[PDB]
Amino acid sequence: VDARQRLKEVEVDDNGQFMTTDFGGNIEEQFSLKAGGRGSTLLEDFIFRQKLQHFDHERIPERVVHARGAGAHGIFTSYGDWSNITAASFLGAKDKQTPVFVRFSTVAGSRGSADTARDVHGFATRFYTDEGNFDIVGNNIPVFFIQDAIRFPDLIHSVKPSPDNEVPQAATAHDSAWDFFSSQPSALHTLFWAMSGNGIPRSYRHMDGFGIHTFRLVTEDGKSKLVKWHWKTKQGKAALVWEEAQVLAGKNADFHRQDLWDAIESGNAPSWELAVQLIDEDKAQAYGFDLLDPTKFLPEEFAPLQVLGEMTLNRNPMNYFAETEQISFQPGHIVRGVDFTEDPLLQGRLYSYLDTQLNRHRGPNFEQLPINRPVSGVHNNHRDGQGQAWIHKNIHHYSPSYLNKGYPAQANQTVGRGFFTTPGRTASGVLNRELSATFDDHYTQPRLFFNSLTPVEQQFVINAIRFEASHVTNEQVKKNVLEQLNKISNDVAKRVAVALGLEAPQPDPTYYHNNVTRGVSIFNESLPTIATLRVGVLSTTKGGSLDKAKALKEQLEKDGLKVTVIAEYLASGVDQTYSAADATAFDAVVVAEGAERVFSGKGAMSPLFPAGRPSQILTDGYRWGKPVAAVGSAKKALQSIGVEEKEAGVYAGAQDEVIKGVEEGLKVFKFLERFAVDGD
Amino acid sequence: VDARQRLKEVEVDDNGQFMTTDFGGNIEEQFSLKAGGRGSTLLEDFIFRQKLQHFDHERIPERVVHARGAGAHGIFTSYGDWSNITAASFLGAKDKQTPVFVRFSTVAGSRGSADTARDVHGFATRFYTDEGNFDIVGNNIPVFFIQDAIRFPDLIHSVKPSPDNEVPQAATAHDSAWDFFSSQPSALHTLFWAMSGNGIPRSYRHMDGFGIHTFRLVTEDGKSKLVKWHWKTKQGKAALVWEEAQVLAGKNADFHRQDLWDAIESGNAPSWELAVQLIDEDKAQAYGFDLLDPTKFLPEEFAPLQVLGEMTLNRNPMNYFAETEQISFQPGHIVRGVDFTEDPLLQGRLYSYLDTQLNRHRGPNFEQLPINRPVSGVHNNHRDGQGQAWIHKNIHHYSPSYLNKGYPAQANQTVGRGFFTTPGRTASGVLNRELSATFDDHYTQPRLFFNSLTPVEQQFVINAIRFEASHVTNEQVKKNVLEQLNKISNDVAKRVAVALGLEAPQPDPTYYHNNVTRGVSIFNESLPTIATLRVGVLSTTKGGSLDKAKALKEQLEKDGLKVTVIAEYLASGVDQTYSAADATAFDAVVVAEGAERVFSGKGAMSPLFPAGRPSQILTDGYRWGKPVAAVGSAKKALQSIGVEEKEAGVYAGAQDEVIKGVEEGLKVFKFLERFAVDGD
Amino acid sequence: EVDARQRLKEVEVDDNGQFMTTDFGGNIEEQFSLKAGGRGSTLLEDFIFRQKLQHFDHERIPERVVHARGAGAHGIFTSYGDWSNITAASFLGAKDKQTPVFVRFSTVAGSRGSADTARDVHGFATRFYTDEGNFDIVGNNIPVFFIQDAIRFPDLIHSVKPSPDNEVPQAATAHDSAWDFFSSQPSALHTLFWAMSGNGIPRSYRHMDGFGIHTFRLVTEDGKSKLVKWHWKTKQGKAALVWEEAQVLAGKNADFHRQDLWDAIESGNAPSWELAVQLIDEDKAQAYGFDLLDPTKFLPEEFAPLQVLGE
């Protein structure tokens, strides 16, 4: 149905047309106006200045956080009529379709940073409903660092580069960040989620999404339930390994944004299911934590997810800047049937997102931008402003008036389908600058998170902390980290402290426990589909390998895979060169038959690629847990690096046997047997 | 038929609609969200913040000059096919129509200043042609203060208020301005034009317009003629008197902008004829001055005006801000068939106007605003920018390129009807920071202007200079002015020095002359029409005076006038009260019969109006040169202040006699017999 | 000589006795543009021209959304006592204690160029540069406001300001849009009368009283609070014009009030105000027939007399 249907009116086609100035008129803009042939350029060359001025002013400020990101258009379809729980129009009827836009991001890097940096990721959705725009602005992690919004600058200042040198870019591996994590123990829970697979997803399409905050759903009668928003990926949860991500950050900074682009362009639109948890208003403090605490998540054993619909991203942007870059999400973009809660973190966000748009867009009229415009229509008494795109017919721009005859009219719960705060809500107590004592358990839930991970995944979190805390140059801060880690788990504190060359503190069993919850793990489940995944078939231009390699590709593509045929140079079947190839770009590596010649001898030393290139791709690919394969005689390649076909995730033999093997391996995606666990 | 047809698609009707946020959704915005009855306002009241934020950001910077102004839409129709002189599309066929917008202004005042302050006035026209926007940005005075654009800050800084206290507003009557005039003798010519009637027009519709600069018209073969643009008013040239203007600045600051509004709204659209002077390129320095000197004009005896068309302003703006305020004129808004000249003042303007838009609009995308958009279409490689309203289809935004197939294409003289600089133009000599010696005659032409004025008009200019220079607190600057005044005319220097209480310098015959030229005078000719002009009929609620007055009104209105019936209070036929009435709002005053009651006795002292009000309107109206009249018994009112019906501009008798006399007097408009001239 | 502008000395620039410079330094002449030949075109490489004009082109900043037309002066505030019994504020914490101030007087509906002598509510905004931070009393010359909720401020101001179609009339409430609001929102009636009184057309800035309008709170170190109202009483007396006078004055001198404030200070006759307050016990908030959190009401001095804390 093409969600960008509204955006058609502002599309400009310069095809078949002559050059123009921004004020019209046909021009040539390749030569300046000079005085005397090899003369100076003239100030009266209006064509030059108008062209350069637009170029000079092309830049707008990047987002203060989540600067690095990408987005797409889509449609959200409701599965039912949910008036039993919410009065929201976009969830009000079965099979009802609403246009959406989603932008995925990383929190700490700037516009040019790598997609594959370790960071929390953003998952922000706009619903273009017929009752106004509604935004679920969320992360891929269900918990946040802080419990009060007034502490947001303190958190961000710490994680972002040092103010003296602006080092390091897009990393928490420095003293200031881990100074904050240790000094503000509230941050520990998200810290663990960051050090898990969530910090390095395979793709935007392979992560779940969370509103994190508890909200409220309201029905037309005004009955409310506390809610948590979920997005469950229909493509499955998948993650990389840190050593892979680092190399990937260099070979392709655009890994995530390219992958989302290619998937949609290839007809494989990603999709998520929108799920919720409904909690009775009286059960706010029931489940071992305050539900107004964003450093907590609610296990599905206490409240299982009920899915309300599915959203699919099937359209790509036409211009990145106009659409992806300029879009402005706010949690304050709320509609009838939804309401906020007294979450101290959420309360502050409402101010921030609206205020910060004044900075990026240089004006109060940024919702007049095509990608920010609603489909529902805008009528009010707002006038003037910088870059006002509309002309208003009503010359009586005030609301208590005789002359406009009462229009625009005032809408509420009973009339006009207007927004209303939940009627049952109250305020009781002293005016205070403090936080509830129900917020003071910072260690129980990270323990719960750690316990609910597979043993290798647990090692990954620890291996990440070892790497990160190693970069801290202040010994006392590392001591402070061990103290906070110890309060969660003695084993974690023990295991990390080895790398730091420090001593493990004595156990504190106050917050220790062995509880477990589901859905927080990434690797323990297999991917629903292998569609869109990429296999790199290493071959050579010498002999019959290429034709042999080509035949392998045709077979793989029907299953949904994307295959790249690599060789010394761009021959008939060659997609990519060895110079341009790396293991990070592929979910699986498979050596074609006869390609053994370049893994040893003169073949591995050609001017057409850096020495050892084919051997590294296999080495890197295997060591990173990916499915690896060789076809027939190609076994020579696998034993060159010490990999027996007897192993798990490794397949050697006939092409037909190999194909079935790789496709099986891709469902597992990552082979965790190839990583060493502490104690052994 | 409607000049604003392009603007229709962006018009918003809030009628019959419910209140919305700027992002959509129905709301009520009359109460804040509070915690409890008499509680504090909540940060989560998104409706409040969204509403107030737009209000807080309503203001954009005012224009650095010409801040005070008003405008309207219109149509320009060509009278012929002028391809013999220019390749311009909008003058390329007879009866060809182009939508226009015109904005009239004053140069030194801010957004709130009075229309009736003595100042140079602006006359900026945009032609929305099918070959791009073309702007003639000019004043109501054919000459400017300076000969080089680099001195524009110096000129403007002096005339504008003093930087310490910001006093005085919209006036040249201070030391700083007259310091500049004396120290930069180039300003003397426009200074004289400013002190004439041109400095205080009756209306926007009653002033001529000038491009001031010499431009070039170019034909398709590339042959050029030197040109000067003129706008000749179809309503006639009219001016006020200084004592009237001062009082008018208080009673109605919006005098000019309202008059332009009322004229269009009442079916009386104003019109101007577009005329030009054509000069052969070899005769640039032929006529006693350099034609690249903007402090000089070319008398119509050397080169007469040829009219090419007529423009009529028939539509009013719907929103002042969106249309009038946000519009951006530039002299660099030029099209094919027109070109610039080496006028040092013009050359600088081209930079300034484009650069200054970055300040007012906070972005490079201000020609995307509806009132700045051309009707011809915009196709280029400009991307991004602050508040980008478009989405660009071409992802190959560079030239030259293979992938876009050559589009947008490059146009020039031979291909694509593109803009081209005149091919005959040359540059010869050293690179210099100097001005030509042909520019050094600053006194001859101001004398020429003075010589061509009626004796009373000459008195007006002198009476104006006496007033202004009286406000200078530095005696020496006044000495400096008299010396510069003396070089023009010994009589003027003599006459001015009387008011200042100084002594007239001895005569200087260096630049003295008695030459004369036509078209520079305002009062000496009679108005083509009295339509829209206003008569104020002073009447009363007592007796049968009102009905007598009512009959007077209907007769007068038939002839095209607008009649306001004034009385003690708002009775059946009463347009205005005496408290709300003033002589400045009317072109003629006529006392109705039986209205004698309010000029003497208890009638002149009512609680309903300030004492002496009816007597003042007649006193002011008479003393200001306007036609005054009394009907029947009403003659006592005229002798209440000492005015005999035998006088000129005064009419007493029966109603029919008064009507015919007044309408005759309005054609005269102003009676210069009532003003004292020196030596009398 | 206390010189309230002593801190401002560090940023004063004296161009006397110096040569012309660019904004980035270096000596220049800026009266001629750079041309190619005797009568040539101006060159893009004339850095001197562009640097000069660019600043001129960008000289303008947005005018205030309200109270656009105004003027101001520096001063000193001296406390009359040690008021720690009612407030812990440093600038009122000791007798004879001096605090630098700046005050800006204004009109509410006109723009930057409007007349000082237009009928409108007037502004009276005072800043205290205390040694515990800036403290601002932003108030009018009238003790009451048009509206009881801030969310209605766009509605009120839009109505009084010119009509959006023609932007007429300037700095006036004499039109349909304003009086439509006054009739439809009856809360505005009180301030409307204050506007139609002498307060709408003062003789000078130095001849008007001042009000915080809102009820605030004064707190002591122990945390005990009293409801408070701020007052400024003029040591020069209250004086106003007549409407027929003001209109004529609006034309002959738009800068009348701002010039008068300038001249008095310049002539050694500095104007002065006394700061007075009304103190109300927290239990007495609704005592006097209305809510003290209503800004459309004022508290008569028979109910609570004024106590002066300083000048």
Ligand code: HEM
């Ligand atoms: C659970 C807590 C939070 C979540 C889930 C979250 C998520 C996000 C996401 C996904 C974005 C990306 C916007 C986009 O993709 O266009 C974003 C941006 C932003 N967030 Fe947060 N964030 C949180 C905490 C906060 C807090 C506490 C504040 C302020 C007090 C804040 C202020 C901002 C600002 C100013 C932006 C920039 C948006 C723009 O410039 O358009 N965030 N946030």
Ligand code: HEM
């Ligand atoms: C013959 C000389 C001049 C004429 C006829 C003239 C006329 C005008 C007029 C009518 C306007 C009104 C714009 C409007 O109504 O929107 C204007 C504005 C302006 N002029 Fe001039 N002017 C002259 C000299 C100059 C010079 C020498 C400069 C700079 C070197 C300059 C810079 C400007 C600027 C920056 C604006 C503001 C326009 C905007 O904010 O969009 N002018 N001029």
Ligand code: HEM
């Ligand atoms: C008792 C009620 C009010 C009083 C005493 C008052 C007083 C003032 C004064 C004296 C100024 C001028 C500041 C200056 O001269 O620099 C001002 C400006 C302003 N006021 Fe009000 N006003 C009131 C109502 C409101 C309300 C209810 C709002 C918003 C909800 C508001 C918003 C503003 C804004 C946005 C400015 C612009 C200040 C600037 O641009 O720097 N006012 N007010």
